[PDB]
Write a protein that binds this ligand. Structure first.
Ligand SMILES: Cc1cc(=O)oc2cc(CS(N)(=O)=O)ccc12
Ligand SMILES: [Zn+2]
Length: 261
């Protein structure tokens, strides 16, 4: 990726990605709009199992696109299973996509509604040994998506908000141990699920998407901090890190299933 130049600006944004990553116009791209009236309840979907009690966060990184909270996935600690998944998926990192204003920022939409932001907890299928091998498989990753709306503060998110000052620019990282991701979950685990892809290049079609129906609420102050981050590196002209979301892509030959009636 040392020669990647994609981003979210007018000249290298989502509409340009297909040039270096043809799969951008593929058959199972993400995100997508979730038409609530067309999604069908699937009584055969197992309950979702989110086991994060043993999760071990290690570091937070500004990668020039978003910020990644990374976990130690060298062992089966934090795992996602059940739901539409077969097997065990290990949590490797989480990040967000957000907007310049509260009216936009999420990648998936619900009946065309855009949320202020969207949290993605990324997990890889342990049957493939490592993340690199997993992304080359149609069932290699499981990403849990959670919508954020602006209202009351999310206590569990403040530790993340407070460390952002230390990783303002691209390439900066900071120790970030003992962060509990259970603090970012809504009360209900009802979800929609469909086969899709990574939403940033390489846009690989290796993801089983699980998007929770219940959004979490974060405060204006919390999201304002996200918007103070920079896409640029230290010493460069400031480009605020905002609107780092890819818009909804064609659903094509796919069905979105609901875990609830
Ligand atoms: C670890 C990793 C490798 C890769 O090639 O692409 C990624 C894309 C995302 C963004 S998202 N929105 O698709 O989760 C997150 C993590 C990765
Ligand atoms: Zn993402």
């Amino acid at each position: 990726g040392m020669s990647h130049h994609w981003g979210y600006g007018k000249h290298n944004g989502p509409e340009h990605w297909h040039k270096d990553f043809p799969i951008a116009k593929g058959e199972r791209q993400s995100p997508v709009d979730i038409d609530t009236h067309t999604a069908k309840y699937d009584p055969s979907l197992k309950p979702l199992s989110v086991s994060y009690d043993q999760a071990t966060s290690l570091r937070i990184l500004n990668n020039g696109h978003a910020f990644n909270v990374e976990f130690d996935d060298s062992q089966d600690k934090a795992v996602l299973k059940g739901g539409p998944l077969d097997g065990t998926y290990r949590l490797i990192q989480f990040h967000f996509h957000w907007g310049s204003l509260d009216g936009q920022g999420s990648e998936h939409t619900v009946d065309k509604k855009k949320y202020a932001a969207e949290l993605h907890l990324v997990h890889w299928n342990t049957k493939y040994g490592d993340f690199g091998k997993a992304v080359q498989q149609p069932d290699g990753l499981a990403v849990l998506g959670i919508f954020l709306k602006v209202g009351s503060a999310k206590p569990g998110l403040q530790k993340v908000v407070d460390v952002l000052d230390s990783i303002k620019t691209k390439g900066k990282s900071a120790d970030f141990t003992n962060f509990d991701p259970r603090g970012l979950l809504p009360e209900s685990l009802d979800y929609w699920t469909y086969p899709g892809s990574l939403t940033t290049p390489p846009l690989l079609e290796c993801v089983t998407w699980i998007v929770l129906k219940e959004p979490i609420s974060v405060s204006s102050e919390q999201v304002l901090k996200f918007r103070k981050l920079n896409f640029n590196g230290e010493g460069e002209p400031e480009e605020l890190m905002v609107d780092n979301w890819r818009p909804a892509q064609p659903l094509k030959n796919r069905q979105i299933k609901a875990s609830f009636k």
